[PDB]
Amino acid sequence: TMTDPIADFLTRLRNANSAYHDEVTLPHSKLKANIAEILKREGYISDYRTEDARVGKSLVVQLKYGPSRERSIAGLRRVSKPGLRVYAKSTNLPRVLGGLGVAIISTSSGLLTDRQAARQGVGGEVLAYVW
Amino acid sequence: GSVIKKRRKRMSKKKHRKLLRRTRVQRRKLGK
Amino acid sequence: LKKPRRNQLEALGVTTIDYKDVAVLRTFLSERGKIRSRHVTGLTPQQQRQVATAIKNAREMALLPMAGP
Amino acid sequence: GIRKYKPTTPGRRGASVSDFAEITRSTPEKSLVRPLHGKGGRNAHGRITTRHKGGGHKRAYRVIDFRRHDKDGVNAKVAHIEYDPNRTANIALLHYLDGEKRYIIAPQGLKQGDVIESGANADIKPGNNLPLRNIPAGTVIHAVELRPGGGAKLARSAGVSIQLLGKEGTYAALRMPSGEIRRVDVRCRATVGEVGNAEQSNINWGKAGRMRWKGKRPTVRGVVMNPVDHPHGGGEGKTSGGRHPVSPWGKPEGRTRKPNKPSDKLIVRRRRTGK
RNA sequence: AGGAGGUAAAAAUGUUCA
RNA sequence: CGCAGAUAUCAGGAGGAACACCGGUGGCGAAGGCGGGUCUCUGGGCAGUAACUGACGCUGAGGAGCGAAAGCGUGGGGAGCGAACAGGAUUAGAUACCCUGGUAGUCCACGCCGUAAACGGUGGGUACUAGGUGUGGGUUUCCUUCCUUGGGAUCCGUGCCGUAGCUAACGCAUUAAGUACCCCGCCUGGGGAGUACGGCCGCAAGGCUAAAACUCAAAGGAAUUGACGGGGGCCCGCACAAGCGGCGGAGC
RNA sequence: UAAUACGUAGGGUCCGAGCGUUGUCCGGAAUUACUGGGCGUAAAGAGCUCGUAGGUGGUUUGUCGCGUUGUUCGUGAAAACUCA
């Protein structure tokens, strides 16, 4: 069955970005919403709406493309998977794409990039690389 | 893929089973 | 209601297929006493299967011949 | 069915016995028990006529009704099913509603409480006795009379049965257990069904003593007798007879049925061999 | 364009490096 | 085989096995597999309703069960077919292909076996990612003939084609071999060898687990160019066929 | 029989009181792949299911703070390694 909606979310994003879709609807989770907020702030998506479905709540990500359909995202990669959770200390955080990327880190200071995590001196669960 | 890979195993198995049919009673007198 | 769509037994003349209604089953038979295929009749698989079973029961009760000639 | 003994002794290794399962009573009905005494295979002269007989467990004869002619329309209920040493089949004790108690051959499928009918207006069920004029074709029957009133002669052993093939006139054609097809007067009566205890054949009697209890004395082979005793006798070392197979009285192998018999015209097809 | 089935029986092998 | 009255034909009977047409890129089943009809008993699935429980789910080591065909046991049966076998033929020889027969077996009952190119050579579950076209089952809806397999929407299937993507390529392509997550099984050069020893299972056959020594510098996969084919198609040539004249036999 | 692959000469080259060989280990070998592989046809999906242990776990509130993470203390002998 479903085992990580984080990877589901990243995959919906990746496949829609490959197919040049403008929207991505999926189920809602507070964690996925926070991830979408990070992606919005780092500029990998245009916006994200949280709306109501027939049963629960949905996330509608308005993706972003340039004028010549340049994919605003070039890759997504779940890292802390179920079955193998990976945790990063503040020192050995990962540099995605030589730093031009963004690693999503879950910490007790919240959900924040590797840059923010190194700034705040903390680390935690490495959810994704979203160059 | 190719059937040569079948034919090699085929010949090995054929010869082995011939050997067994040939040594059936010897093998029985020894094992049993 | 033409041959590629003549399921009268679903559309009109909607007759409950019975092993007794030989007047009905004769149209779904050849002169040689064989069952006609869907591609000639126009029937859905359900109605063809029911007609076939009807014909076989009728043959078992001599209301139709096996090998008419 | 069959109970296979466990190999606690070499006389019990592969042995089997009946699981007397369809049997309900260990004791017989005393009114229907005539006595019996062994003969030893010996006749009025006191001389062995049939060899390989004697010893034997004591036995008593259960009066079987092979002539079920006097109870037509008088139903019965199978009161018991019992062991009979005189036969391979078991026997069913019937209580007729007129109070008569009788024994029959215990067909297959028959149990306590099953109601047995006799006569022409009887149902075609196991155990019911009818004339063949009233039994339809393709029916499996047993305990058939060869003659009207003569009593059941045919299809009496365990597991056995007769297949009524057809009725043309006053003659009903019967496939017999041997495969022999023969004609019998339709007036002859038959019990419907097949005889029970068909598992009997599959019994391994395990040891010599068991057949000595059953009354089978040892059978000596002629090739180890002397020529004065048997044609096959003689020879230094083993022999296959030194001649073609014969009886101890020199009769060769071959058909011993008397030709020109009366039954030759009733018989349609002798049995088959080899095929 | 629309519409049955067929027949060639058997007839092997290939020193050298290549 | 017949001429001892065969084949053929007509009538009747016995018995066995399989079920023409329906019947197919069709349906069901976890797979194996399932096709005469009826009855009985029974399992699974799908759609719709959303009444219910409220993550109870997914996978599954080992284990257990099911598991084509052949085979084995016991007991029946045995028409046809038919290993073996026997003749005949072909052949240099033919333990073969072909023919004539024909045993086990195929069939039934109960049980063993437990393998297969058991193949979609593709483990199961879930989510997503262009469409087109058939077809099977069901729900609805709109033109309305208010005829209606007229069409559309949707769920579950099953096929063909075709994007993106993937692939060594062939090809896969919403029934993924794509994008991803969970779990399991399996691989780690070819042989030796799925063999030996040991053990387990098995009546047996044999199966399951499973090596090493030694040996090779490859084995392999896909595709290309040719060549070849007792493969195909089209076309030619004294190539054959149709004819004439010769050689091979004599002497030189 | 016309050898830059053998042997020798010259000449060149790589090292240099060393040079070569053998043996052993790692590497190269992403060739047991955690980093870092795969299984349609290359070796590789058990014949298929059921299901035990195990692994894994939809949305959500609160809590524990076990994992996780931060900080600090103690220890992590010396030598080694590294920096100066």
Swiss-Prot record, chain A:
Pfam families to which the protein is assigned, alphabetical: Ribosomal_S8
Gene Ontology CC: one annotated term: ribosome
Superkingdom, taxonomy of origin: Bacteria
PANTHER family: 40S RIBOSOMAL PROTEIN S15A
Subunit record text: Part of the 30S ribosomal subunit. Contacts proteins S5 and S12.
Reported function: One of the primary rRNA binding proteins, it binds directly to 16S rRNA central domain where it helps coordinate assembly of the platform of the 30S subunit.
Protein name, entry field: Small ribosomal subunit protein uS8
Source organism of the structure: Mycolicibacterium smegmatis (strain ATCC 700084 / mc(2)155)
Gene that encodes it: rpsH
UniProtKB/Swiss-Prot annotation, chain C:
Family the entry assigns: Belongs to the bacterial ribosomal protein bS18 family.
Species for this entry: Mycolicibacterium smegmatis (strain ATCC 700084 / mc(2)155) (Mycobacterium smegmatis)
GO MF, one example: structural constituent of ribosome
SUBUNIT field: Part of the 30S ribosomal subunit. Forms a tight heterodimer with protein bS6.
Protein role: Binds as a heterodimer with protein bS6 to the central domain of the 16S rRNA, where it helps stabilize the platform of the 30S subunit.
GO CC aspect terms: cytosolic small ribosomal subunit
One GO term (biological process): translation
Keywords: Ribonucleoprotein, Ribosomal protein, RNA-binding, rRNA-binding
Name of the molecule in the record: Small ribosomal subunit protein bS18A
Full-protein positions shown: 16 to 84 of 85
Gene name, Swiss-Prot/TrEMBL: rpsR1
From Swiss-Prot, chain D:
Biased composition regions of type Basic and acidic residues, renumbered to the chain: 252-267
Classification via PANTHER family: LARGE RIBOSOMAL SUBUNIT PROTEIN UL2M, RIBOSOMAL PROTEIN L2
Family: Belongs to the universal ribosomal protein uL2 family.
Keyword Ribosomal protein annotated: yes
GO CC aspect terms: large ribosomal subunit
Basic residues compositional bias, start-end: 36-57, 268-275
Protein name: Large ribosomal subunit protein uL2
Function: One of the primary rRNA binding proteins. Required for association of the 30S and 50S subunits to form the 70S ribosome, for tRNA binding and peptide bond formation. It has been suggested to have peptidyltransferase activity; this is somewhat controversial. Makes several contacts with the 16S rRNA in the 70S ribosome.
One of the GO biological process terms: cytoplasmic translation
Keywords: Ribonucleoprotein, Ribosomal protein, RNA-binding, rRNA-binding
GO molecular function: rRNA binding; structural constituent of ribosome; transferase activity
Assembly behavior: Part of the 50S ribosomal subunit. Forms a bridge to the 30S subunit in the 70S ribosome.
Annotated organism of origin: Mycolicibacterium smegmatis (strain ATCC 700084 / mc(2)155)
Region span, Disordered: 1-19, 24-57, 222-275
NCBIfam families registered for this protein in UniProt: rplB_bact (TIGR01171)
